[PDB]
A paper describes a structure:
Here, we showed three complex structures of 6mA demethylase [name] [name]-1A, a canonical isoform of [name] ([name]). [name], one of the AlkB family members in [name], demethylates the DNA damage modification such as 6mA and 3mC. [name] [name]-1A protein has 291 residues involving an N-terminal extension (NTE), a nucleotide-recognition lid (NRL), a DSBH domain, and the CTD. Like other AlkB family proteins, [name]-1A requires the binding of the cosubstrate α-KG and ferrous iron for catalysis.
Although we finally obtained the structure of mut3 [name]-1A1-291 full-length crystals, the ZFD exhibited poorly defined electron density. Here, we illustrate the structural features of [name]-1A by the mut3 [name]-1A1-291-Mn2+-α-KG structure mainly. The DSBH, as the catalytic core of [name]-1A, adopts a typical eight-stranded (β9–β16) jelly-roll fold that contains a major sheet of antiparallel β-strands (β9–β16–β11–β14) and a minor sheet (β10–β15–β12–β13) to sandwich Mn2+ and α-KG ligands at the active center, a large α-helix α3, a small α-helix α4, and two 310 helixes (η1–η2). Additionally, the DSBH is notably wrapped around and stabilized by additional elements from the NTE, NRL, and CTD, with the NTE domain packing on one side and the NRL domain and the CTD on the opposite side. In the [name]-1A1-291-Mn2+-α-KG complex structure, the Mn2+ ion is in an octahedral geometry and coordinated by NE2 atoms of His-184 and His-239, carboxylate oxygen of Asp-186, and the C1-carboxylate and C2-carbonyl groups of α-KG, respectively. The binding of α-KG is also apparently stabilized by hydrogen bonds with the side chains of Tyr-173, Asp-186, Ser-197, and His-239 and salt bridges involving the side chains of Arg-250 and Arg-256 in the [name]-1A active center. Notably, the CTD interacts with and further stabilizes the Flip2 region by hydrophobic contacts, including Tyr-272, Leu-276, and Leu-279 of the CTD as well as Pro-124, Val-133, and Phe-138 of the Flip2 region. In addition, the main chains of Ile-282, Val-284, and Leu-286, together with the side chain of Tyr-272 of the CTD, form several hydrogen bonds with the main chains of Met-141, Glu-143, and Val-133 and the side chain of Glu-143 of the Flip2. In addition, SAXS analysis showed that [name]-1A existed mainly in the form of monomer in solution. Hence, four copies of [name]-1A found in each asymmetric unit were due to the crystal packing.
Numbering used by the authors: 36 to 289
Amino acid sequence: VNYKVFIYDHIRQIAIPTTNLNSQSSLEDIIDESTSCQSVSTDGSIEIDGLTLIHNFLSESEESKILNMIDTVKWAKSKSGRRKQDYGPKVNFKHKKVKTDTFVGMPEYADMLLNKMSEYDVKKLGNYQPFEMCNLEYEEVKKSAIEMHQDDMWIWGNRLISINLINGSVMTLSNDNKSFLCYVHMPHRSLLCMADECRYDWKHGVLAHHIRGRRIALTMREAAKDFAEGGELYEKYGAELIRLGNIRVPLSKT
């Protein structure tokens, strides 16, 4: 609460400070601020490192094909009212232990999604090797939410990709040391990449009140430098994870 609040201007990729917004601010006010911020001046602006939001990343046709494949696959129970579908290794983060027995491969839609990411930006989202692609489902009735946190950096890489599917939401990012809080409004069919400062310096979260109806987030993760070639864990675990990630599970009826 005792922190500066900023709203993200996608057009200029800068965060503009506001006293109108607050910790408990409603989703509607944040969407309203996102439109109002473009008018506001650059004074107090911060630049987020590695935060990229792509509007209209997925066409309605592309979303529909992916959603039919996702809903055809079974949904698994998760903490925080969320539900999860995982296409990645099972890892004990505490003991640094990885099991690849349950990893049969990446989902079929990954090939289409990855190619599109490279077409927009080979530098920003290209050269991506998938390690875990997890689809997470949030329902307002279940008050689904993800608590504020920074994802593991041991096996997961710098770039974190979330695509909002059935509906959009607001990402809450907190830099506790500098006492700065930013709200990023993620619209329907939007890709958010959190990396660099957002991945480590900032923490990522989605609040329960920012969830309206049902939303599915197509989370994608990449190989950590250690698991990749030139790393200690590549031979023991990484090489298999790269091959298994290359494999594509058939999820579409033709």
